[PDB]
């Protein structure tokens, strides 16, 4: 920071500049910041409420607050998601630069219901990146919080608090307690600015293509095969009996399934089918009970989204997994809503690659024939990974979160994160902001006790984003019309993407990445 | 180092999610008789079970428990018999110790 | 343009102006929700534009005395073209710029 309270610290960008290769996304918002736990550090845990041996948590809740940008559609204008998916392979972000700046600070009085609020120039706020990631981290868990989609909305920063080891709702020895002043942390006051710079790690590009081929089908429908199979175990029956007999074919246009391959379908874990018509569903509650999910230290954790799996068969749109979608809200939808309201994703772009993540793996035999013995098989729902799988992460959405931390740990199969996006050793870094406590008049005679009385005040500026993207370029020689993504067309009440006529911001549906297709 | 955060719980206590799961298959009985309802509720601090999360635990080989009190324990040799071992060539091989899991 | 004037692929381009939103105290516990909540303020101050203009000579030979653009003479209640007794300022009729005359 340089000047004084008169003059602005910094301008305000929200811009888009495709160039080339690259996309850089400009956002800027306005923000503010309450006073969080009256400046204390409280430790939260499920004995308050009793909850469930699943559910029971221990940890911290801090004054702290933090600013959040983990939505592609924080960065990206509808328009600009177009051009994006549209013309693109793939894309990963670069470099990230960060801004605070305008910062106000509000102090608020309440008398006998009137209140009055005026400007502090004198107090200051907090702001510090931890770049050593030395603190919980709690990006990538997919909260609300972040910048809001829509430029000339004013959002509230979320607070700050962690979790820990716990025992039933105890702490265990190994607990941490973080104290988040013990970190150095720049001080701002109305004329000061914040900025720092990041470079993200080198990571896989996103795939925003859709293949045109399936593994089963990467053959030559023309070409029959040297390789034999073993076609019958009987002779042909002439309506008689059955007589013993090994015949061989050839693999070829006949006959593709029985046709020998290289690959193998990716891994599943498998979940439950539900349909979106509530007459095919059974009468019960399956939701938790029929639920598939993981057993982690006595605790029952369900599994969500899953593994990357394609979500419905061939000709099946209504049915879906159980808790194997990425499920988002409609404008205006509570936070609990029943199926009309609720946006609805679907894989359906990983079918050549990946199974259907309401069906079986395969098939296999699990006893050894004999004269007597008949031959048994039982089928498998979940298969970890085989030499020779191939498979697709589940693809990222205009409201999807763009990356997650990959913990620390000693080993770690494929990083991707579940729900989506770029898996990242080394994030970027969480920013963190408070307001500087601000003491009530102390009582004129010594007293050691804590204060706990300060000025009830808030602060309140901008705060600017810009990411760098890279893309790769779309070369298919097809020669037919790809998919797009097209805009409504015909009449309606009221544009898509837009706000309606009482000013509110509503997004109609998700929009994934993958239209334009590539050979598998 | 042993860490001191679990997969489970890496979220935010304090802050509630923004993607729904299916929370219940009935309409919320009124004790008469359930009706066929899709419901979704967001992942929250109330319910971290149902949460979305982006990590699964490590791989395991699963293998059978023993108590160190011996009434607590059957009466009968699972020694060897019970035992978690893979089969190799004909042999089967006991699995020690096996894939680094929690013991207790 | 038919009203009249200057036609310009690239005219003076728009200046927009507003009022940074000034949010009102946020409740101290996290919601997601708009604000819709703002302190009422606006804004003042001072605007100037400079434009520069080009002239065409009047070159004409006409003999006779040219048409011109003539205040009233006569006395009345109060003059053209400025403040009336209210401090109302009043423009009595428009002002065209066709007057001098030249060969067709
Ligand atoms: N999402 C994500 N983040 C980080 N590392 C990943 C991810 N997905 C896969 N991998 C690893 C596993 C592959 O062997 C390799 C491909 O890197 P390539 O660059 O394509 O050669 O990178």
């Known amino acids: 920071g340089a000047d004084g309270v008169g003059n602005a610290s910094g301008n305000w960008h929200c811009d888009s500049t ?58 990206f204008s509808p328009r600009d998601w177009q051009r994006l998916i549209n013309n693109n392979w793939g894309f990963r972000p670069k470099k990230l630069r960060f801004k605070l700046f305008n910062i106000q600070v509000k102090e608020v009085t309440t008398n006998d219901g009137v209140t009055t609020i005026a400007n502090n120039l004198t107090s200051t706020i907090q702001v510090f990146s931890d770049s050593e990631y030395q603190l919980p981290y709690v990006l990538g868990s997919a909260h ?5 989609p829509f430029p000339a909305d004013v959002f509230m920063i979320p607070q700050y608090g962690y979790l820990t080891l716990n025992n039933g709702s105890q702490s265990v020895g190994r607990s941490s307690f973080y104290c988040l002043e013990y970190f150095p942390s720049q ?104 639920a598939t999910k ?24 209504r049915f879906f997994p159980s808790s194997g979608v990425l499920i988002f ?11 009309e309201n609720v946006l609805m994703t679907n894989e359906e772009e990983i079918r050549p690659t990946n199974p259907v993540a309401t069906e079986e793996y395969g098939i296999v035999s699990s006893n050894l024939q004999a004269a007597n013995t008949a ?42 994160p579940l729900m989506g996006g770029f898996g990242l050793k080394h994030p970027p870094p969480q920013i963190l902001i408070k307001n500087t406590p601000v003491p009530a008049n102390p009582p004129e005679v010594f007293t050691p006790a804590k204060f706990a009385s300060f000025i009830t005040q808030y602060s309140t500026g901008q705060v600017s984003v810009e990411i760098e993207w890279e893309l790769q370029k779309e070369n298919s020689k097809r020669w037919n019309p790809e998919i797009q993504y097209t805009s409504n067309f015909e009449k309606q009440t009221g544009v898509d993407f837009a706000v309606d006529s009482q000013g509110v911001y509503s997004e109609p549906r998700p929009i994934g990445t993958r239209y334009l297709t590539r050979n598998l």
């Open 18 to 75: 495709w160039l080339g290769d690259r996309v850089i996304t400009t956002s800027t918002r306005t923000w503010a910041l309450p006073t969080y736990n009256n400046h204390l550090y409280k430790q939260i845990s499920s004995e308050t409420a009793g909850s469930t041996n699943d559910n029971t948590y221990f940890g911290y809740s801090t004054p702290w607050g933090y600013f959040d940008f983990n939505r592609f559609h924080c960065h």
């Open 144 to 148: 609300q919080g972040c910048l809001p």
């Open 187 to 290: 001080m701002l006051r109305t004329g000061n600015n914040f900025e720092f710079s990041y470079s993200f790690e080198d990571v896989p590009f996103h795939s925003s293509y859709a293949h045109s081929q399936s593994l089963d089908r990467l053959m030559n429908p023309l070409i029959d095969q040297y390789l034999y199979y073993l076609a019958r175990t009987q002779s042909n029956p002439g309506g008689t009996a059955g007589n013993r007999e090994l015949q061989f074919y050839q693999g070829g246009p006949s006959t593709m399934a029985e046709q020998a391959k290289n690959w193998l379908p990716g891994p599943c874990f498998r979940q439950q089918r539900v349909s979106k018509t509530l007459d095919q569903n059974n009468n019960s509650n399956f939701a938790w009970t029929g």
């Open 294 to 317: 993981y057993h982690l230290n006595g605790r029952n954790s369900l599994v969500n989204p899953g593994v990357a799996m394609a979500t419905h068969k061939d000709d099946e749109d």
């Open 329 to 339: 809200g409609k404008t205006g939808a509570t936070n609990k809503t029943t199926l």
């Open 375 to 416: 031959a048994q098989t039982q089928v498998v729902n979940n298969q970890g990974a085989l030499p020779g799988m191939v498979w697709q992460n589940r693809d990222v959405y205009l409201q999807g979160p763009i990356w997650a931390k990959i913990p620390h740990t000693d080993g770690n199969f494929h990083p991707s």
